[PDB]
Nucleic acid binder design. Structure first.
Ligand SMILES: COc1cc([C@@H]2c3cc4c(cc3[C@@H](O[C@@H]3O[C@@H]5CO[C@@H](C)O[C@H]5[C@H](O)[C@H]3O)[C@H]3COC(=O)[C@H]23)OCO4)cc(OC)c1O
Ligand SMILES: COc1cc([C@@H]2c3cc4c(cc3[C@@H](O[C@@H]3O[C@@H]5CO[C@@H](C)O[C@H]5[C@H](O)[C@H]3O)[C@H]3COC(=O)[C@H]23)OCO4)cc(OC)c1O
Ligand SMILES: [Mg+2]
Ligand SMILES: [Mg+2]
Lengths: 775, 775
DNA sequence: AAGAACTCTGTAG
DNA sequence: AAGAACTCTGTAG
DNA sequence: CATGCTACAGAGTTCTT
DNA sequence: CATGCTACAGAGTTCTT
């Protein structure tokens, strides 16, 4: 808070207020205020003020209760959690406003410390839409008359700026779709420099002084419509399902006349802002938080995996977590933050009984934390180190499969793939619990024997249940059972009704009166468990104390209780057909729930009921990916073999060709062309680098004779040429094998999936025997 | 601080306390002390406790005053700064000690909350000797009887561990002298894995389990000698002059019998620890904070420059400060920290009037800070952008000169050069102020006309002062003047006695009574100037108020004073022959003090009196570097020309040689040898990569015929052969030019230094005209 | 009038 | 017997 | 160099009435 | 994602004492 000169004074109704979502915005606004000279309209430290929103603020909609409105008036009670928040009460004190007053007159408006609050956020997809969203939603929920009478204003900054050489006027485009339309209407992207500002601090000194010179412009007054209140309740309200039905549709872009009305006169309706920016943020947060059913993992997590694949390919040597996070932020264009990325890396590399990653993609060296703190006892990322689990990843996410995935394009540059679809569905093996903007994601691990039988029966034709499982595919029968995994769990799973329950085990010695529990349900970390068992009041009347002798990889907890209470828990706590008296006592029963909300590869939410739907949706994607990989391999291999044959023919012909007595490249190429040599680009044949079949053929119909030229002389020896003849023989044999894999009865790549299944389960067993540390 | 159970009770004399230098040691201690079950040693949080020293603490020697000792007893008064320090008073509260009591008897020691305190620091140069040194110096200064009886102990973790395959006992070597003594006494470094632990948190789980299995070992009790107190006064407290005379000698390594006495029975004398670890830290910090007189920049800054040279060589595109800092911490092995590196990068890339870097090595994009806050108002390293100043660096630190520098070896791997000696001495152009462990470094910029004349007269023989300046070299005459720079300074410099003074300029309007100052003394930050003038109580009655309208890269401050006080400052504040009444009143002067303490390339401190000594010491280094560059160029160029002539004549001969009808490499190489061909390694000739003359000749006496083999076939064309013939002609012309540069009269490479001087001054003029922002 | 406190600057923790 | 109350994860400001 | 309030959703104890 | 006490020397400007 930098108080203005005439703040809370006589001229205070003419002042403004700057609301900054970040300290980068704080730095930009400080620079703009310290400009000073040549700005008769650009305000100085006076009449400006300053307030930092502290990142994400909370909405009052889910906090207020609206109780005791039966007295003929609707009174709203602020939450006790809402009252003591620092940012909200800070902006209340700064603006000098009161909740009870309804600012329907000019005098109560003049009571305010500032004349207009002008928020200033980044133009990234969150922020404006989120921070503005919750901010003006809170303002609408408490003081709609401020928004109606023009008290809230947006400081809209350019997102993408394109400069033409010799001209100093920006195009200052504000949306990605507008920039795409301008690029398509333009003939070419020549004599133009394109700059992306994914944050306010990206602006330079000349940039900030140019945009602050016209500070009277680019400030937009918010207006409230009659239909805005319904949108405010829908996007920010207690009823989550009410937004579910409007998070499955998609963002409606603004019409050209609406944008013209916005830019001609700066009156932004709240309904349009909620429908565009807030909805776009909500869709983005759904996509960035809910895992993909093909991946089983978050977009950030798949970005981390792609960065690890690119980083540890050359060398699997040790790397620190902060360095690896910087690497994947630099190379995969992660423009969000650093310590969230480091936290995601740490959680991905964690491995212990009850950890969310049953099959982690990273080998971890350092203190990642055991099951006692649930991964919260992990150390700092600067000294914790991670390396790539080479065998598990190389069997589980094959590079040949990684070529043919769809890829996410960021600013015209390649980034992490759209999805890694693996040989076994990680949406089934992994297990975690996330919230999102409208949905919840919960999964529990299935055993790697039911899923293995299911996939093998679907793929192998020798399994007698292959036809039966295919009939289950067409008719949703689900004959084979799916059971929760028993790995790292000495308890027993039970099924009742439509729910699975996990049970810990206990030993009772009545002559010693110690309740010794050795296995506990597979998610609660045994320390929050003993804190929760220390907060139950009735159990305080029944026990004496709790001692924990549990080390890494094992659990044993001894409970001392009153000698006369040992039977009392029988009468007070109960022993139903599903749980025992002691299981009710120590809360060793745990019902496991599944909320199977996933994001489609297109981008939308798909809901599921059981894991059979997950498996039967994941199976076709691997089907056509194997199918496309096989004929891509066939085409690129026939191109490789014809190019190798051309090399051999030129090698055997150049002795009598005598091309050495030629001047330049054109004459040599003409001679090779009139000798009938095939011109094909060998740099697209030796290394194809994810080229589709039609574009590979259209690239290879033309080509260059550079494979004649770029071949080194050292291959002139006859033994080398015999080795290349043997290589040609092996390439033709591989072509025959690929062709006969294309024509097999069930589907192409039938036995192929068998050896990746065998390799994956062998590597899993190897890592499972040595605490995933391998070596 | 976590309280140990039964600590400060009946068993308090049997306790211990773990003193951790930071959270990195804290994580290892939280792991090792508990370690689950199987804990004979390393008690599971029993009688141990935990305290963090918070990095670096202060020492009590420079805080206490020892006043009023005339009453027959020496009483010591603790400083007000020492009393309210968090860490010291925290450890006082944890140990339950009192300053007044001298713990001679056993009951006073039993009063203590813990039986002993065991320090736990990294084994890095820093921390052991520094943090240990200050901690036990504070203990010695207040309670020597605790150290005498054995209250103070420390745990001595192994710095380097060598593992033999099939054997699970590490060698646990503690010093690098011991480590490379073992390496030289060993036959070979085979069947051995070497692990460096540059910090405690780098130990793994099995490593900390192995160390805590024998926790009763590796704990050493400190003992106080009669000669310890003198060394305590030498290294800490007192005066710099008392330690200067012992920071020029060097560390004395411990004898073998002393180390045997330490390891046989764990009684470490304080004198040996002070003489080895503390002195080694002092020398390291002297080398780390005092700039080299050749470079003008410290070890960290030259590390940053070398990392920038490696990073921006392939592409000079923009990189963030954090990404570049991570790059230089990775590739240049900066094992100290992260944010200090980023701060050093920011200070290196700063450029404004009065900034410490008159010729920065990095061009900047962002808010690095103007002259008003003195660079303290720079933004976060998250978004601030840096790039390499391509022209200035490429003319100023030549890559051909960068090849031949000596290099710092870190763990057998190359790192930043030992010194980046430039074509013009940055120890003269730059200006800054650094304290260190015994010395102070202050410099003031000289103008780029006196130094240009000096260097040109030393180098160019056409300058009539060349012989006179050489006579000044042999006789220390220093005929040519050296003056402080006037760049970015509208004031005037004056010389009185042996000191230069910088003056601000002022305009007086007596009818308007406003003191308008437009330029203040060299390097005074605008803000502080006003805060310090606002603290002077005697000048409060003489002024009314102060206002500042100064924008970036300009100064104008208006002072309003009392109308009757305008003459009063004439009488009370005198106007001497050297200063005006107004200059004395507004403190518009500044005396330019210079403390020319530099570090030698060997490592020692060298002191200077004037900048002529700096110039005359820097000149010979460039002399032999140009000379050795000329021999290296001549040798590698004659090898290149014989290699090129060989390839040309072999292309001409292979038509009738007919080597294609040969089987393998050995037969082909034998045929080439029997035809009289010279085997020389073309990968050592095309790219020499800093090979000295003798080792280059000894590598090139042998070699390989791979240049026959690794040549691509595409060069078979006759126009290519004519191009390589022209290239051979140009190489021979360059050989002739190099040979005639070697034989010129003053020294080899005479006119060479003329064109780098011309290029450097042209690039400097370009930077000056563009505010060091070339684009 | 002499002497104890109090900041500064880079490189560390 | 209903409701307010507080955690609990993985990505983000 | 560890850390600190928040969103979002859904259930499960727990306190509290 | 800003920030907080420290070392080290030496030369100052206020502070009393
Ligand atoms: C003061 O205004 C600002 C606030 C922030 C927040 C922030 C806010 C906090 C706070 C802590 C944080 C902290 O977040 C931490 O990140 C962790 C990483 O993600 C997941 C894994 O877990 C997160 C923690 O839950 C969270 O605590 C900052 C890290 O980067 C951010 O984006 C965070 O504790 C108090 O309020 C950023 C700013 O710069 C734009 C601001 O100007
Ligand atoms: C909580 O974690 C720890 C932090 C620290 C210190 C530290 C200590 C501080 C403090 C701040 C800092 C902070 O930097 C300070 O500011 C300076 C700013 O100019 C740069 C050039 O040099 C920085 C120094 O490094 C340090 O003087 C940390 C940065 O890296 C460190 O190592 C610093 O303010 C209060 O006490 C030590 C630890 O034990 C080993 C820790 O466990
Ligand atoms: Mg942002
Ligand atoms: Mg260290």
């Amino acid at each position: 808070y930098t108080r203005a000169r005439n703040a809370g004074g006589k001229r205070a109704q003419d002042c403004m207020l700057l609301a900054a979502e970040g300290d980068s915005a704080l730095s930009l606004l400080r620079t703009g205020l310290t400009l000073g000279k040549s700005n008769p309209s650009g305000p100085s430290f006076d009449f400006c003020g300053m307030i930092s929103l502290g990142g994400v603020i909370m909405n009052a909609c889910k906090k207020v209760t609206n109780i005791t409105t039966d007295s003929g008036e609707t009174i709203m009670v602020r939450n006790e959690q809402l009252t003591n928040n620092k940012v909200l009460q800070g902006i209340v004190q700064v603006l000098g406003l009161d909740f009870n007053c309804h600012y329907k007159t000019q005098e109560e408006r003049a009571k305010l410390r500032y004349g207009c609050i002008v928020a200033c956020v980044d133009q990234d997809l969150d922020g404006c839409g989120k921070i503005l969203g919750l901010l003006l939603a809170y303002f609408h929920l408490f003081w709609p008359q401020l928004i109606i009478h023009g008290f809230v204003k947006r400081l809209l900054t350019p997102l993408i700026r394109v400069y033409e050489k010799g001209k100093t006027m920006p195009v200052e485009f504000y949306y990605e779709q507008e920039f795409d339309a301008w690029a398509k209407k333009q003939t070419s992207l020549v004599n133009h420099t394109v700059k992306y500002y994914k944050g306010l601090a990206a602006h330079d000194t000349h940039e900030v002084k140019s945009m602050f010179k016209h500070f009277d412009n680019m400030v937009y007054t918010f207006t409230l419509d009659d239909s805005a209140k319904e949108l405010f309740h829908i996007y920010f309200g207690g009823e989550s399902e009410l937004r579910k039905r409007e998070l499955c549709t998609g963002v409606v872009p603004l019409t050209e006349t609406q944008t013209q009305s916005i830019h001609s006169v700066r009156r932004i309706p709240c309904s349009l802002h909620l429908q565009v920016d807030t909805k776009a943020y909500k869709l983005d947060a759904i996509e960035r938080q809910i895992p993909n059913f093909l991946d089983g993992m978050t977009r950030a997590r798949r970005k981390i995996l792609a960065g690890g694949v690119k980083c540890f390919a050359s060398n699997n040597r040790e790397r620190k977590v902060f360095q690896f996070g910087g690497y994947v932020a630099d190379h995969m264009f992660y423009h969000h933050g650093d310590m969230s990325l480091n936290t995601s890396i740490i959680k991905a590399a964690q491995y212990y009984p009850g950890s969310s990653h049953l099959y982690p993609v990273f080998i971890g060296i350092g203190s990642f934390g055991s099951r006692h703190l649930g991964g919260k006892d992990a150390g700092s990322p600067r000294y914790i180190s991670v390396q790539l689990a080479s065998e598990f990843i190389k069997t589980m996410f094959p590079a040949e499969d990684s070529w043919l995935l769809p890829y996410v394009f960021e600013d015209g540059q390649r980034a992490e793939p759209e999805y890694y679809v693996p040989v076994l569905p990680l949406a089934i093996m992994e297990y975690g619990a996330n919230p999102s903007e409208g949905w919840k994601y919960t999964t529990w691990a299935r055993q790697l024997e039911d899923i293995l039988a299911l996939v093998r029966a679907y793929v192998d034709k020798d399994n007698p249940k292959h036809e039966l499982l295919h009939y289950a595919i067409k008719h949703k029968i689900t004959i084979l059972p799916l059971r929760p995994s028993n790995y790292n769990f000495k308890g027993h799973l039970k099924r009742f009704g439509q729910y699975y329950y996990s049970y810990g085990t206990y030993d009772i010695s009545e002559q010693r009166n110690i309740i010794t529990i050795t296995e506990l349900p597979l998610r609660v970390p045994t320390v929050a468990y003993i804190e929760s068992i220390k907060k139950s009041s009735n159990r305080m009347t029944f026990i004496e104390e709790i001692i924990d002798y549990s080390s890494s990889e094992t659990i044993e907890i001894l409970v001392k209780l009153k000698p006369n209470s040992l039977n009392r828990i029988v009468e007070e706590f109960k022993e139903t057909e599903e749980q025992d008296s002691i299981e009710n006592f120590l809360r060793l029963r745990n019902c496991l729930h599944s909320h199977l909300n996933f994001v489609k590869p297109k981008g939308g939410i798909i809901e599921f009921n059981s894991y059979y739907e997950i498996l039967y949706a994941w199976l076709p994607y691997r089907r056509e990916l194997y199918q496309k990989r096989l004929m891509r391999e066939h085409a690129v291999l026939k191109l490789r073999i014809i190019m190798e044959t051309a090399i051999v023919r030129y090698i055997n012909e150049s002795a009598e060709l005598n091309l050495s007595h030629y001047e330049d490249e054109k004459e040599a190429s003409r001679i090779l062309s009139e000798h009938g040599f095939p011109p094909l680009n060998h740099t697209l044949i030796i290394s194809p680098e994810f080229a589709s079949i039609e574009e590979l053929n259209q690239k290879a119909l033309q080509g260059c004779y550079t494979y004649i030229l770029s071949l080194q002389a050292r291959e002139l020896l006859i033994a080398a040429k015999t080795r290349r003849v043997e290589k040609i023989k092996k390439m033709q044999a591989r072509l025959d094998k690929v062709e006969q894999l294309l024509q097999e009865s069930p589907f192409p790549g039938a036995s192929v999936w068998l050896e990746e299944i065998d390799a994956v389960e062998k590597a899993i067993i190897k890592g499972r025997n040595t605490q995933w540390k391998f070596h």
